[PDB]
Amino acid sequence: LSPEKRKQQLLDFALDVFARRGIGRAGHADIAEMANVSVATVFNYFPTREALVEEVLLQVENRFSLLLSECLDEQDKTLHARLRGISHTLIDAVIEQQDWLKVWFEWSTSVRDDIWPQFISGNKKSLKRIAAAFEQGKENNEIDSDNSSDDLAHLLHGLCYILYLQSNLHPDQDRMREQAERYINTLYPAK
Amino acid sequence: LSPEKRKQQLLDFALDVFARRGIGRAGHADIAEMANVSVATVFNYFPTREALVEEVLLQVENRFSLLLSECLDEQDKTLHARLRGISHTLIDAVIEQQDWLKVWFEWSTSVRDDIWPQFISGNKKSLKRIAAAFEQGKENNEIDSDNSSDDLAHLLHGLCYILYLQSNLHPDQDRMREQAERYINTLYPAK
Numbered sequence A, B: 001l002s003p004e005k006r007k008q009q010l011l012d013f014a015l016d017v018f019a020r021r022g023i024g025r026a027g028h029a030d031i032a033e034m035a036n037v038s039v040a041t042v043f044n045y046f047p048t049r050e051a052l053v054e055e056v057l058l059q060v061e062n063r064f065s066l067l068l069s070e071c072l073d074e075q076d077k078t079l080h081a082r083l084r085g086i087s088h089t090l091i092d093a094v095i096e097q098q099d100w101l102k103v104w105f106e107w108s109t110s111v112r113d114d115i116w117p118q119f120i121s122g123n124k125k126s127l128k129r130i131a132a133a134f135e136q137g138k139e140n141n142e143i144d145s146d147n148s149s150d151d152l153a154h155l156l157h158g159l160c161y162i163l164y165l166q167s168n169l170h171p172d173q174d175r176m177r178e179q180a181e182r183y184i185n186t187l188y189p190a191k
Helices: A003-021 A028-035 A039-045 A049-072 A079-095 A099-108 A116-139 A149-169 A173-187 B003-021 B028-035 B039-045 B049-072 B079-095 B099-108 B116-139 B149-169 B173-187
Strands: none
Touching: A003 A028, A003 A039, A003 A049, A003 A099, A028 A039, A028 A049, A049 A079, A049 A099, A049 A116, A079 A099, A079 A116, A079 A149, A079 A173, A099 A116, A099 A149, A116 A149, A149 A173, A149 B149, A149 B173, A173 B149, A173 B173, B003 B028, B003 B039, B003 B049, B003 B099, B028 B039, B028 B049, B049 B079, B049 B099, B049 B116, B079 B099, B079 B116, B079 B149, B079 B173, B099 B116, B099 B149, B116 B149, B149 B173
């Protein structure tokens, strides 16, 4: 009933519907019925369908930023330990069927929708941070310097994509952690 | 228009509609208007939404297979020329805004949908073909033997995903072919 808790509950319900039915496939009435509140109440928190999609996608973007922030902001970790931590958190997000990550990947392939500039613009901040991790790895001679940090960062997103699909096919923590390590060793050979 | 030509035309129109609006949207009336036939006629060929989707996705699956066959069936090409050809064909499919490829990638991230097991079941005949290409490359000492052919094949899918997104951002043939070469050199260094 507290306003901040209500708003989060409504956002989580909309994200739930987006993950099940598709981004923007939630009516205010649908959200109202999940929250057992009135339609007027949902419109109080999200005056338009546009505002609801924008704020849900902002939450999704923030969750991805937080996933990288937890693994990349530790100061005493090699590049390969950081990559392992990212792969581990992604795998668990799949096994836990986390709605935000399912919407994140659907968002990424929505290339003809009007929401797709916001996917790109939000994720260049994440690419910048990932590239910084690869640059620090190069400085520490943990990987070779012959490939650009931007290319390495883009390739990490490609790794996350295949790890995402494979973890949905086989949601097995041990099996997928073993798979992630092999991918990382192939893509990012040690130095 | 004989009935089998009419059905193929409706399927091609359905692909157009699904690429614009999403695989999950009721397209019978939209397809009807594109074909200049009644919506009853479209339901004669596709009695349910589920039938229309399954048959469109089978066409999409076949189109990806034909891309692979065209790039893999020469059998005297080197591995890196095959990888280059696949990447170039993908880039041009984005620049030409080919509907089947947009739908293919949306299908790939539809992981909770009843349609996803078919994405996987068609994807393993693709993986197996790509894996064999990598194995032949390892046989001719064109790449390191250090990484399993199945892993290399999965990683190629991740490379295609990143190239797909970047080509949609920057549908610039020169820039994307340069980008693809860097990716191939990073993931699959020659010799």
